[PDB]
Design an enzyme around this catalytic site. Structure first.
Site, PDB file in Angstrom:
ATOM      1  N   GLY A  77       0.849  -1.200   0.000  1.00 32.69           N
ATOM      2  CA  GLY A  77       0.000   0.000   0.000  1.00 32.69           C
ATOM      3  C   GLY A  77       0.875   1.237   0.000  1.00 32.69           C
ATOM      4  N   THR A 120       5.078  -0.947   2.448  1.00 29.61           N
ATOM      5  CA  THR A 120       4.744   0.239   1.694  1.00 29.61           C
ATOM      6  C   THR A 120       5.417   0.070   0.336  1.00 29.61           C
ATOM      7  OG1 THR A 120       6.593   1.587   2.585  1.00 29.61           O
ATOM      8  CG2 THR A 120       4.499   1.712   3.772  1.00 29.61           C
ATOM      9  N   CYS A 121       4.986   0.858  -0.628  1.00 28.99           N
ATOM     10  CA  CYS A 121       5.435   0.793  -2.011  1.00 28.99           C
ATOM     11  C   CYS A 121       5.117   2.171  -2.595  1.00 28.99           C
ATOM     12  CB  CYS A 121       4.601  -0.262  -2.780  1.00 28.99           C
ATOM     13  SG  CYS A 121       5.414  -0.772  -4.303  1.00 28.99           S
ATOM     14  N   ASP A 122       6.110   2.942  -3.022  1.00 20.83           N
ATOM     15  CA  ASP A 122       5.842   4.332  -3.531  1.00 20.83           C
ATOM     16  C   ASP A 122       6.650   4.692  -4.743  1.00 20.83           C
ATOM     17  OD1 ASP A 122       3.746   5.643  -1.506  1.00 20.83           O
ATOM     18  OD2 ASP A 122       5.151   4.620  -0.321  1.00 20.83           O
TER      19      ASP A 122
END
Ligand SMILES: [Cl-]
Ligand SMILES: [Cl-]
Lengths: 175, 175
Positions: free
Chosen positions: A70, A163-165
């Protein structure tokens, strides 16, 4: 509008909840690790995206490591709250979270917490042997900012929240 | 509104579609065979109710007979279109339908079609032996208004579509 409902029923593959956070979301899934970075649960364009399961994880019973991604949103939504686990007080008070799959619910027991910027070893999903998963567990336990009471063996199976951005935040727990 | 979405994700257990009918609906399920006679897919009061799976059917792989219910609505919605199968032309042109479970899709091959007012033998879900299911299949094949090309044995598993509200309309097919 029932066309959209049928879409939603294939796309939504689970549910995730962590008490005392914003993380109480449907888990979506597509054919890659990209679509749900940019679309909400209704498949409309949205920067916040959705919470989504890694496209490689399609078998609850055998997948040794199931990964859920997310955004680390600056408004505090999505997976921004994963960082609360760097506060020891929060972790002691929240040793577990709940993960629903398409079938059923699990109460996941957290055993490793860390940030990482360039060492992405943790995203491995394929383990030829049972011995390969024990090497994996050794590495990620060492990466943890805490030593865990929770022991876990190559015979267990796990779930990774990421997390992944700069660094990703990562939480890993025993099924 | 995300509270309602979480509700929907537990309640909706599948999807049903039959080409050239209104039957293209989510399959819901509760703890009994009653709630979804009176509530829609959002859990709001509605006379049309929902399409729903019999509360006794909780295992795709072992349930010999999975039953899906819907109203025979006078406005032609829900399961009113099951009656098209009494027209031989329709049946020849539509020997199969698609049933999604929580996991995956099946193309069900219809082998028995009938109306019934007082003989509800077809609602059996429990078969001690494999021989009991072959007695069942013999009975319902005989109840059919057609003799079917499709043969089916006590080793197969089936799905039953039935109205629930003079006679019920019933369609049974091989998984
Ligand atoms: Cl790093
Ligand atoms: Cl009868």
């Amino acid at each position: 509008a029932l066309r959209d409902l049928q879409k939603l029923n294939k796309d939504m593959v689970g549910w995730l909840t962590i008490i005392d956070t914003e993380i109480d979301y449907p888990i979506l899934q597509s054919k890659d690790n990209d679509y749900y970075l940019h679309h909400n649960y209704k498949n409309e364009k949205a920067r916040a995206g959705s919470i989504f399961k890694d496209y490689r994880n399609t078998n609850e019973f055998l997948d040794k490591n199931t990964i859920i991604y997310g955004h680390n949103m600056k408004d505090g939504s999505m997976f921004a709250d994963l960082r609360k686990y760097l506060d020891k007080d929060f972790l002691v008070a929240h040793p577990t979270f709940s993960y629903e799959s398409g079938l059923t619910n699990y109460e996941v027991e957290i055993f490793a917490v860390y940030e990482t910027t360039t060492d992405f070893y943790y995203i491995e999903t394929e383990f030829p042997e049972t011995t390969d998963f024990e090497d994996y567990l050794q590495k990620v336990k060492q990466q943890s900012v805490y030593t865990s009471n929770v022991k876990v063996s190559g015979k267990d199976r796990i779930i990774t929240l990421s997390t992944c951005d700069k660094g990703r935040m990562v939480i890993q727990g025993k099924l």
